[PDB]
Amino acid sequence: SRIPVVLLACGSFNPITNMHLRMFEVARDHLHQTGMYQVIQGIISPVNDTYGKKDLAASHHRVAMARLALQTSDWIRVDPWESEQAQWMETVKVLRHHHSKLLAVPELKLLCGADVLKTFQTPNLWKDAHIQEIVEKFGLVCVGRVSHDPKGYIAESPILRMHQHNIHLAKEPVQNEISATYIRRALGQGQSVKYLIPDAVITYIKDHGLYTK
Amino acid sequence: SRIPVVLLACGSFNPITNMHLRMFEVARDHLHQTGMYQVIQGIISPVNDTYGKKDLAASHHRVAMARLALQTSDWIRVDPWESEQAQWMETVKVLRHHHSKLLAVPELKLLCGADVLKTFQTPNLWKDAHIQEIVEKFGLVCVGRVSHDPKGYIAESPILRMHQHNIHLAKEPVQNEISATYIRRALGQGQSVKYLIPDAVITYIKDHGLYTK
Amino acid sequence: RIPVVLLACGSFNPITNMHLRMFEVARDHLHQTGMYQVIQGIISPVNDTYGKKDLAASHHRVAMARLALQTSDWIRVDPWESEQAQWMETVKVLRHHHSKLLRVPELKLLCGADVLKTFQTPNLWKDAHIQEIVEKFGLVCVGRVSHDPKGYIAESPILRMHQHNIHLAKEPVQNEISATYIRRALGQGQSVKYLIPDAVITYIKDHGLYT
Amino acid sequence: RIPVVLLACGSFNPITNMHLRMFEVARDHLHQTGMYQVIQGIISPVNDTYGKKDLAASHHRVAMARLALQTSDWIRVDPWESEQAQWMETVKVLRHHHSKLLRVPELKLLCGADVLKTFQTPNLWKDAHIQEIVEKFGLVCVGRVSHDPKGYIAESPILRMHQHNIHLAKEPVQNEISATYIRRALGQGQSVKYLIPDAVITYIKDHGLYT
């Protein structure tokens, strides 16, 4: 039979969008169609508030919006652990934590866009030891993005290439037109974002006056 | 103050998608931002069952799915009149009907993608008298589509060019990746289409065994 | 390995890098299957009596196509269709070229996925013609943004019956240029360099086209 | 009307039609504003000590850029940056070229909207450099699918303060080719004709690059 799998998505989810959710569904259908995996759960892990140099709605609101957005999902849930930590954590550490939480144990894989795969190649960005542990001890399910050639990223990277069997490229459209950056700008100008992000998230944004300019 | 406007969308809505709904929101924000219109309502008019040579779920189901999809909309509604007619009707006739239904009367405009605008140029497809009445007596709100140059379509067509003030080009992204054709194929192969079309439409499709291969 | 000739119809008003890329993608796709060897490409501009509107004179479009193809060692423009008295249905251009091949390789129509969607347009194509195209000849489809070729095929009672003769070539590069935008840009005095061949841009300027 | 020189940095491994189109769009955009006259374009390939991996030798990338630009009467490749001992930050290449201009026009960095998004990447750019780029020089941004330049600008405390020196040029044509795909395709023996210049394809073949 099949290897049980849990999908983990890291990011700011500022706010979570229809596209971020779409990614899980495409990743799950892809892993199932290989006939050797059974995705048993998805986890949305919003980044903690100390991260980056770009403003984010408070983690409290980002976790709430993800929870509201996931109410109609019977397999994806938001986990606030990462955002509740005192400080920002490297991706590999969130994976270790959730892996330990699962501990004939399911394989925990990082769900991301092909653009994340390109960042591995950025100098001073990732510790090679981290890139390796991620693709070797956990795995990557990358969903395509216009302008990116995941296959080329994999072939040109010695580490990815050696562990490419742990990198699953999901080939199926995934709403690459909506960026959360656009969603925030539209909200700031009083424009509608309905049908781009869940109705329940729009309601929370309105009720709590988020994303105002 | 402003000219009241009703937006009418024709098409098969087989099934209605997040993108079809997105189109109304983008069209409404665009007309409002010109400062001279106030959109008071949107109407989804599914094509009747005698149309075309491509299979469509029965009009009964297409109207039901649109109604379920529009439950969280406070300004767009599905109107079954067109689909309840004995036979297929030309676009201009559906516009005349809904216009008469509104009868200092709001301006009724056809909402469509820029690809419809290209079809006007197709020989033996549209009666010039229809193209003219549509852009002159009613109006068009076109939402962009990749691969199309609406401005060029307008300039190269003598009729559109003469009445171009009645053709509003909404410039704002609109989920041009999802075609209802793709949605149907995915459903037929047992793949997920969640976050591409409304949850309520997916539920109806499942409950009534629609789009099976 | 079966010899294949690819035929592309359209207005080529003007021919663009996308029209050109279309042949290359289609050819690599057919070769990848292993059962075909593409020996020639043919660009056949539509004649002037056609419907549309601002169509540049056929000899101009044929000349631009020839210039765009100077660096191609396997694709050529064939003026026959543009030189006929009046517009002709696609099937008829395919029969003409089939007759020339015999005076043998398989002649296939090359087009974008958008063309497949037009097959459904009521009163636009005769079913008999669609059937002849995929049954007597063949169809090689190059992907285009927003189109789902596989669904077009599955939903057409005619197309799904001839899947062996319909080849879907995926276009991993979103190189979607529309000639309409090319013409409008030229009209506004803007650059289209690197969107269409340099020789075509020079020809256009020399002959005061699309102003 | 202020004279403007556009400077594009990157690996150009190899230069593609998109990199080229980028200059044309940026130039028409700047001229459209009416307050600028673009007098020169400069392609500055990154030197070999750079991070990445499978970078073709700099003289090869500079040679391909030169070949791609033979038909350009306003854009040129400048090997200075690729000839330095080691990699250099972007600001430093801008200072060097500013110094050459003086020995005056405004020197602006030309890049895609994706570059603007990298400004947010923690520990990737120094704020001082981002500030100098948009305050001392300028930034001309060409649109890219999936990117929202206006939001990048509004959300950056540094960028939103220098909006007069940041020019967003819209790319109405989704001509999005990635050099990574170009290299992979060449590696598999597939065609990239009409995606990059013919002379660059010939150069690549002659020198056994990207095999």
UniProtKB/Swiss-Prot annotation, chains A, B:
A GO biological process held by the record: response to tumor necrosis factor
> How is this protein named in the record?
Nicotinamide/nicotinic acid mononucleotide adenylyltransferase 3
Q: Which GO terms describe its molecular function?
A: ATP binding; nicotinamide-nucleotide adenylyltransferase activity; nicotinate-nucleotide adenylyltransferase activity
Q: Self-association or partners: how does it assemble?
A: Homotetramer.
- Family of this protein: Belongs to the eukaryotic NMN adenylyltransferase family.
| Binding sites annotated in the UniProt record for ATP | H20, K54, K118, T181, Y182, I183, R184
Its function?
Catalyzes the formation of NAD(+) from nicotinamide mononucleotide (NMN) and ATP. Can also use the deamidated form; nicotinic acid mononucleotide (NaMN) as substrate with the same efficiency. Can use triazofurin monophosphate (TrMP) as substrate. Can also use GTP and ITP as nucleotide donors. Also catalyzes the reverse reaction, i.e. the pyrophosphorolytic cleavage of NAD(+). For the pyrophosphorolytic activity, can use NAD(+), NADH, NaAD, nicotinic acid adenine dinucleotide phosphate (NHD), nicotinamide guanine dinucleotide (NGD) as substrates.
